[model samples]
Structure formats: C-alpha cells, structure tokens
Target chain A: GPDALVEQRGHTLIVTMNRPSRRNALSGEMMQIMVEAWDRVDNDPDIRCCILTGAGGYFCDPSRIDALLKGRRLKKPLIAAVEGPAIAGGTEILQGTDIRVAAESAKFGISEAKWSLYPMGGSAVRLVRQIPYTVACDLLLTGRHITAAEAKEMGLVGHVVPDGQALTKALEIAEIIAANGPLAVQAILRTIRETEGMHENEAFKIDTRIGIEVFLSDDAKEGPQAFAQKRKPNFQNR
Target chain B: GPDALVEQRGHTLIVTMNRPSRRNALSGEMMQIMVEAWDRVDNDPDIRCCILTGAGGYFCDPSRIDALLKGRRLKKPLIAAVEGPAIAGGTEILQGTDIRVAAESAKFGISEAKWSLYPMGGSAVRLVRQIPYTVACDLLLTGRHITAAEAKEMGLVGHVVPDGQALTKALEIAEIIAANGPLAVQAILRTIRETEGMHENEAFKIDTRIGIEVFLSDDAKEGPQAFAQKRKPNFQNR
Candidate 1:
C-alpha cells in the first residue's frame, strides 16, 4: 500500500518501488524498506539473491534524493531490473548492484551534470571502475541519455529484453544463482569486492582467506561428494 | 635484427612484439624497447597514443615472463591489438592498457592457475577489476581460454574484428584519439587511474583538479570558438 513492496519467491527476495505516479521516486518509506530488505538478504540464510525493480513503467526518480542506501554494500548479490527510465540517482544505484537487466525502452543517464549538480551518489567514483574510461567520461560530461542497447554495449547493462521483460530475465539469472553453492557464491563475490584496487600480494591474501573458508565449509564437502554420487548438491548453507 | 619494432604513424606510436617464431614472446630486448617506447610517449609532446601488437599473426607468448612493466602505469593511453593467443602474462599486461581490440581468431586466458603458478603479473588483482566478478573468477580458477567474441561480451576486449584486422581497427581508433584535445584526453585518463579505489569525496577532488586544468587550457577556449566560427579546432596541445 506504500511506496515499497518486499516479498520472497523461493530464495530470491523481490523489492519493488511502487510509486508509479512519481516514477517510483525514492521516498522515506521506500528508502527504509530497501535498507531493511538488504539487511534481510545479508542475515537470512533462506535468501541467496535479491532483485530490485520498480512498479508500472518507470524504474526510479531521484527528485526526493535522501541518501538512499548510503555508504553500504550488500553482502549477498543484488540484481537490477529496469523497465523504464533510470536517470540520475537511478543510474547511480544500478552501479552498486552485481547484475543488471533492462527492457528495450529503458533509458539511462546521469543528468546531474547537466544542471551543475554534483552526482553525490558515488557514481563519480564508481562509474569509471565499472566501464571503459573514455565512455564513462563521455556520460559524466555530457549528461545525455542512452538507450538500453547502447547501455548493454558499454557493459552497464548485462542483458536487454523486450519492452516489458526485464524482470523475467533477471529472475532467470536469480534462479541459477540461487541453485549454486551458497557459501562459494557468497565467498567469491566477497573476495572480488574486497580485493578490488589492492596490490597482488595484498589482494591474494584476502582471496586465500575467503577461499579457505569456502573450502572448509560443509557445503564444500557436499559439492564434490554429490558429484561423485551422481546427484545434485544438497547445500545446507553451512 | 631485433625482437621489438617501434615506429610512429601520425601521432600514434606502434610497438610491435617481433618474436613471431616464438609467438612474439616478451624477451629482454622486447621489454627494453617497450620501456623506451613508454618513456617517449610520456615525454615527447608529438605522441598522443600507443598501440601494442605482435608480428606473424601472433600477439604474445608469456613463457619468458620477466618483470615486464612491473608496478608502473602508462601516462598516455595504451591500446592492445591481439591477433593470437594472449595468455598468462600476455593477458595480465593487457589489463594495464586502456583499450583493447582483438581479431576473430584471437584467444584470451590466464593459464597460471592450471600450472599451480601464481599470476604475479597482476591478473589476480586486476582481472576482477576489469570485468564482472563471476566471469573473472571462472577464468582465473579454470584457466580456460575464451574466444574473442566471448571476451568482448565480458568487457575484456573492447572491439572484435575479422581475422588479421585487429591492428587495422586499432589504428583507426588511435587516429581518432590522437586528433582530440591532447591535454583533456591525458587528464581524463590520469584522473581515472589516480582515483581507482578512492572514496567519492576524495575521488571528486582529483576529478575537479584535472577538470579545472582542462577547462582552463587554450584548447578549451579554441574548441568553443571554432564551433561558433563554423570550423574545426586547431588545438596546439598548450
């Protein structure tokens, strides 16, 4: 009934912004629900992946812009499903997610620069790391919108579907992620996130520590044992 | 007469790895020439970009694996043109480059993991930063080679052309890069390299410093004036 909707389907948590009238802008309630949903994904062993999306035809609008998901990283994987325009804060938040799927009509841009507003959503730091430098600078400097195909070509969007199928494609990936070794999946993502920008020696140390943790888990033992037994791995999230 | 060849075409410096019989392996002579070429690109005002390729339809073989370009970043843009397998150290070195183009027959992988040797050439740290985490780990852990189209899809290679056309496409891009405002191009690349893992506030400060430097340059003034006067800008690199 409010601005945000959170529900669980299998092991995937779905959070949708519901204010289509405002293009699903981030309100106080919307932000709080997102923060809580992220906490659930990190703390609840029943969930392995989460999908963030919007209601109606639009993904999000940032006119309300009140420090949404500030200075935090989700421990579990987060995916974005964009059905419509994802401009400014909308484009910025997608950078924090691990995978992105967009509809053919979806649009992406950071319009803050066009109005002399500094994009304080961490895009100034994150966008360059996520894509090619020349392309990233062009987007930052021009403040122009790009189509879904163009975004996919630039590596910003992982998949592009028909005009209304972003969520369908995202769920398809979420199911595969949900079926894998949960501990190994989480550890691999954590290693990559923690080791970014570190030197080889320092980064390897972090990789080894997490790698060892996954190797020692009970799920690790079940993985190979199930293969030897010719069956699917029954991971208990141990 | 040499294992390396350095030539200048317009403002682009082409550094060819010339050990084709050995699959253009990085030898002592080749390494020295590359170091010298990098110095020229940084110090000489005439050169604005560089293209690193190999001879005899092979890009590089990293069996020599000396300390090639260790702990250094190029000040000017570096582009890679791959027509053969770029594995292990070859793949690692390409991570340090700004742009990459590959031919249809090209292959990419980091094979150190399969041999139980650590990828000290820096892929363990840089590959995850360069591409998606899941894809990067699959390559690092499995030591499998991916085709050029797969590499391009994963954002490792920027462009893919027909066989034997990697260098041709690379030169086209290099020409466009060379004809732009040199100061702005260098400053943009510098800002991205220097602020890789920095916090947003700190990153923005670097962005501002370089942004101001370019905005104040004579080319910046000439750019708009040329547009107003209906002519191409004659940038002096001032």
Candidate 2:
C-alpha cells in the first residue's frame, strides 16, 4: 500500500507511515494495512521488534486503534520514531507504542476536542494514565499543540533528539533490544502489556509469569554465561 | 514505628516518613506503620485528603506500596510532598500518590538496578503506567538520579516548589481539595484510579457511577450555589 511501507533490518521491522501529504493522519486504508503488518510481524519469529516511524518528515496514523482499544495487542515491543507533526490521530497512535523517540523540532497535539470531537482514539483513555493528571487534562481540553520539549515534559515523548535524528535514536535503542534474547524480550513485553491493568491478587502473578519463566529459559543462562566468560552472548532465541 | 508518623491536620491526614537519617527507607515496622496510616486516612470520612511528606526534608516507603500494588486502593486523595532525595524505595513509593509536589532541591531515582536488585517496589508496574514507557525503562534500568527539574520534565513529579516548600505547596493543594464537595472529589479520584485500566465500554461506567451520583447529591447543588453566592463552600462530606 502507498500509505504504508514495511521493511526488515536485522531483527527489527521498520514500519513507516508513508502518507506524509496527509501528515500521516491515518486513513481507513492506511489503518488496514497496519493491522496486516502487525499480524505479519507478530507471527514471524524472525521479527524481534518493530520500529514504527513516518516518511517525509511527518512521523506518525487509526481504525486499527479501535481494534486495539477492543483488546487487540502487540506481542513484541513497538517503538515510535517521530520527526515532525504528530497531531490528532497521529498523537493518539503513540499510545500503543512501548518506546518513543521524537525530534526536537517535532510537535504533538490531540486537536479533536477543539472540533467538538472526542479523542477516543486513545487520548481520553490513555493520556492521563501516561502523563501527569493536570497536564493531560489541559492538553485534552484545550486541544493545544506542544513542541517536543513540552511534549517530553508532559511525558508523551521520551527522547527529543536533534531534528531529523529521532529515527536514528529509535534504531539505536531497537538494536540494543534486538540483541537481547528474543524469547525473553518478547515474553517480557507480553508480560508488561498483559499485566498492566492487573492489581492485588493479579500483581504478584507477574513474577511467576515473567520472572520464573525467564529464569528457566536458555537465554537467561546466556545473559549470565556471557558475563562469566567476559564475552558477548549470542542469543539463540531459545 | 516513630519513623513513620501519622497525624490529623484538620481534614487532611498527614503521614510523614520520619526516618530522615536513613532517608526514609521503610523498615518492617515502618511499613506496618504506613499501612495503618493509609488505612486511617482511607477509613475516616472526616479525612477527605492525605498529605504524604517526609519530616526532615527527605519525603516519599515500600511496604505500603505493596498494599497499593495488590489493589488495596485508597478511597481518597494521597498527595506526595517531597524534599531532598526520594530515591530507590523513597521514589518507589510515589506510585500510590495521586499527585506529587517536590522541592527544587529534591532528587528522584529508581536505583535498584545499580545494586543489581530489582525495583520490586512499584517501579516495574506503576512507573511505566505513571510516565512515558521509554523514560520509565531508562530510569529503571540505568539507576539514574534525576533532579526535580528533570523529574518534572519527565512528568514524574507534578509540582516543583522552591527548596523547603514542598509541604506548604501540598497543603495548599490539599486545602483546595478539602474544601471541594468531598463526595465528588473522592468519587472522581476513585474513578481516575479504577478507570485507568478500563477501556471505552468500562470507562463510561465511571461517569455513570461517579458523575451521576455527584449530580444527585446535595453537595453538588451546594457547589453551584456557593459559587453564585461568592462564598466559600462548606462541604459537609454529604
């Protein structure tokens, strides 16, 4: 599809939003392509992580967001690399990513409220949970766009690298994550996603699920064995 | 334990982590003390809000966080008033706070990784939920101490006051909260906490339960009436 491009670099799948003319505002067609790509990435054991970015400067897309809101989830980690404006649906889509990198020149906003539209795409439900309470309310109610600096302060974006460097930084982090044991990394990501809403009786189960599982995994041994031998561990994705 | 002191300051339950020499690292007895303090604050209708602070300018415990992680939720607002260093367990305990106030001189870190100890204290689950995902992971894995300025930039600390002023700022906010319709405040707080993990279908229930209930309450009428009368609200906890 013209609106989406999917490529593989090492173990990372680079999914770029291709409709920069629309400022990467996710169209119905674009979102469909995305769902398929996500499925492909998840089903393919070769893909360890996904670096989601945009083409032509605009960095980030949505009906797929509804599917996500309806309980669909990604198994592997998804990191966002934003270079320009990530507005409206653009900002909302970041809610699903596990990591985020934005250029210093990037701007972010959820302007649906100004048009008397609700930011159901994820802002209403996830923004407050992700950022400070008052800041989330202010951004949602005012429909204001904030620079990368302010966006970082609001906890919406993580790294604010130099202009045009967001993608590079995201790739750097993805490479580090990719070097880890694939089974362990994917399982850890799954645990974080699955257990996020859980509490009380459900909270301790995280240790049983992620902790003990990783401890018994072969990569867990490699993580330690590499240190003992003073050499880099080559994870076999056991 | 005297290390954690509990006091009644009008309608605000003041819980202070008093072990400044140890930087308020919660002991078993201190944790027990904290749990009881939280219970008292939660159970008392007269105590509409909580101001959690450190006695000797240190601010922010671990055992009480266990109750919070387990879904033993507090029914009212708990605000953090931090000064000096809120590190490791000190910073770990902020997960339970609804709002946070830190002095300009304050510092925060999740340094468990430095000691090769897992931040079993709320950092794993709550920190990611509380801030941007990548930032949370960086802090967790790197064991870096961020200044209040940097922490505020990360949306981890809500308010950064001048040194020696966190408690005052917290009390100011607490007074505003205490003066509001108690039922409404508590209900909204509950809704924010409970509805955080909820989706679209479940999110609306929060409004149905909390919003509509407050609308029908006499205090709700009092809120509008008091505003029209240009007088302070006398929220009788109705």
Candidate 3:
C-alpha cells in the first residue's frame, strides 16, 4: 500500500507505481507491493485483468536497475499503460507484461548497458525472442531510446494511444479478456505459460490436456446451448 | 550412405535428397535417414551446420502427397537451399529448418488443398505460427504458389539469392554460424527454440540453466583464446 496506489474501476483494477516525483523508480518495497497486488487480483473472481501504470507524467525511471534484479513474478495478465518516458526499470517491466499500450508521448529504452550494466531482467534474452535478432540487437547493444511509433514498428508496443488515453485503451482490451469465460481464459493462459520451454510434442500434450478439461466443462456445453437460444451463456466457472 | 547422402565442403555439410528421379519426394526411408542425420548433427561436436538441398534443379515433388503427411522432427540447424519449385513436401521440409535461402527462380506452395488433401506435415500449424494468420490462411486454403521474392516478404524465407546461387549463399551464412563458439551457438539456438510461448520467469530459468552449461564448456574457452591468438583454435570437442 505504501509503495503502490491501487484503485478499482468497473471490473478493471488499476495498479499505479506511485513514486511519480522519482519517475516511478520501482524500489524493492514497490515491487513487493506490486506482487502482492497482483496476487490479490489473481484470487479475486470479480477482477479479470489489471492495468499497470505510473503516476504523474513520467511512466517509469530507466536509470533505476535494482528493482528488476531482485527477481519477482506477477501471474495475472498485465497491460502496461505507458505514458511519458519509461526507461530502465520501466522498460524492464515491459518484458513481463502480456500487452503494452503506450501513449504517443511515451519514450522507451534499456539505457543500463550504456552505463556499464547489462540488462539482467530478461531483456537481453526476451527482446531477441520477441523481435528479429538484428532489430533487437540494434536497440539492446546501442541503448537507443525509441518513440511509441518506433516501438510499435519493432513489435514492442501492441498499440499506441493519444496522450492521457493509455489506461483507457488498456481498459478496453482488459474488458475484452474479462468478457471471456473465466475457466477458459485461465486455462488458455496457463497452457501458454506452462508449455513454454517444452518440446513441440510435450507442449502439444499439455495443451491437449487443458483443452480437454475446458471442452468437458459445463460452461462449454452452455456456450453452444446459449448460442442456439440467442442468449449469453452463464459460465459455471468450473 | 544408403539412406542419406552427405557431402562435406569446408565447414558446410551438404545433405541432398538422393531420390532425384522422383523429384526428391521425401520417402519413408529418407525421413528415417534425415531424423538420424539431424540427431547425429545435433550431438556431433564436429559439424557446425547443414545445407539441405535437392539433387536436381527441380527441388521437390508435390505429387507424392502422402509422404509429406508423416510427422518428423529435425533438431540441427538446417539451411534449405532451394533452387527450383518447393511444392508440398518441399514446403513442409522447409518449415522444420531454422533458416532458408532460395534462388530467385524458386517457387513455393503448399498445394495440398488443390489436390484434395490436407497439409498434415506441420505446415497447417506452422504456417500460421511463422506468418500472419490471413497470409497463412490464403496460402493454405487457396493453395496458391508464390515466387521467392513474395515468400521473403511474407517471412517464409530468410534470404533470396541469385538464380543458381542459393546453395552458395546458404553455405556462406552457415560458415558465419560455424565460426561462433559451438557451445554458444547450440545454447543460443536451443534457448530461442525452447523459449517460444514462455513467460519471463520460466524462460529466465531455462536461459540461466543453458547459459551456465555453455559458459562451463571447453569451446567457450577456445572462443576467447582464438580471438586473443588471432587464429582459429582447434576445438577439442569436449
């Protein structure tokens, strides 16, 4: 609570990194609160997706490195509502989220390498995986900062919104995910995450297992039945 | 020797589909041999990378549609040197390779739908995975064939070379990969492959594990030693 400011709007929970004066540099205490907040959101059946953003104009401080090096995990689907400059810690946090919505004014970089520090918060490895090796290397090795438009071209940011609309766009996408059956949504996320690093056969096996469970659920039966009846299905959450 | 034909040239291994009269239509025997060759190359400390090409100017046949339906796995880094048309089987085999270099004269298609057959050789799944959904669907459903230039733009082929020069260009790139530390090359390839669809924490765990193994290998020592000595140090294959 001391580290992050939390608020709920409709079915969306907004977690703001509250250190706006410090450019929302995620300190150790901030990460702890953020992790706890994510856990709470994960357990709450009412809340579907969480929007993570920074308070004030600056989204996050790029120079702060310790926040990511400490190592933490957030399980729920997170949409990063990036505004202003998201530098080191800001960019590192981007590596952990499912989707990212950056304001047109947003700037992003992993400037740590320029300051004689490597990006150990999974940026070096994850960046190459997300984008082509040549393109990702151009950004990582050079410590070049990019605008939201450039970030979109590089496939880093999924969408770029007008200034003051980062959270609004994020909420729009969050509602889309929230509208899906909870059990089906959770299964899809778990299947994707758990099968990562598995061989194709092993990964397919895991996917099939989860798929079967969802297929057999009462909600699955209700979906088709409701469709025939021209009504929304009442998902059992099984 | 009976099932697979291997020709060594400098650092490149030229693996040809020997059944040229049949237009290299990947037989069961060929698939068995390829599986073994790939496994051997993946484990072999001597081989750097491989160039897979057809024996004749006509790369492969789409006529033997059933042969392409069988499932197989290729573990080693393969560069498909396509000089002519890569139809059904040709397109499927290319999907398993890490990189592809095609002659400007090359034509590619997964025309199974045209023949009233489904593309079961991982293309149906890998098509959408490799390229955008609409593009993949257009190719699969319509059974349309495209030139090398179009394939390159669609993210299907890594590089397009001058006519009759695909093999040469593929070897040139293979040599570059060969020059890197063997352990580092293997680890990087493995990391990229395994981390697909993984979360940051899970990917980090796999990356750290593989990184440690590569760092501890004798090939790692040889890489820096050779750089300092200004000569290629003979790797002990330890």
lDDT of 1 by residue, A5-48 (tens): 99999999998988899898878888888878888988999999
- Residue pairs in candidate 1 whose N, alpha carbon or C atoms collide under 3 angstroms: B19-B24
lDDT of 2 by residue, A208-238 (tens): 4454444555666766667568775677666
- List CA RMSD, all candidates: 8.8, 7.1, 9.4
Docking class for candidate 1: incorrect
- Please give the ranking of all candidate structures by lDDT, highest first, separated by commas: 1, 2, 3
Q: What lDDT does the true structure give each of the candidates? A: 0.79, 0.75, 0.71
- Per-residue lDDT value at B200 in model 2: 64
Ranking by TM-score: 2, 1, 3
TM-score of chain B of 2: 0.93
Answer with 1 or 3, whichever has the higher lDDT.
1
Q: If scored against the real structure, what TM-score would every candidate get?
A: 0.60, 0.64, 0.55
- Give the winner by lDDT: 1
i-RMSD values for every candidate model: 6.9, 5.3, 7.9
Each candidate's fnat, listed in order, reads: 0.07, 0.15, 0.06
Kindly give the stretch of ten consecutive residues in candidate 3 chain A with the minimal lDDT sum: A61-70
Stretches > 4 Å off in candidate 3: A1-129, A132-238, B1-4, B61-72, B225-234
- lDDT (tens digit, per residue) of candidate 3 on B1-238: 3444777676557777767777777677886766666666666667867778887775775433322333433334567889887898888777766677889989999999998998767788778766657999999999999999988777677578898898888777676655555555555456656766665566667666654555555665765566567885555444
Location of the lowest summed lDDT over 10 successive residues in candidate 2 chain A: A61-70
Decoy 3 TM-score against native: 0.55
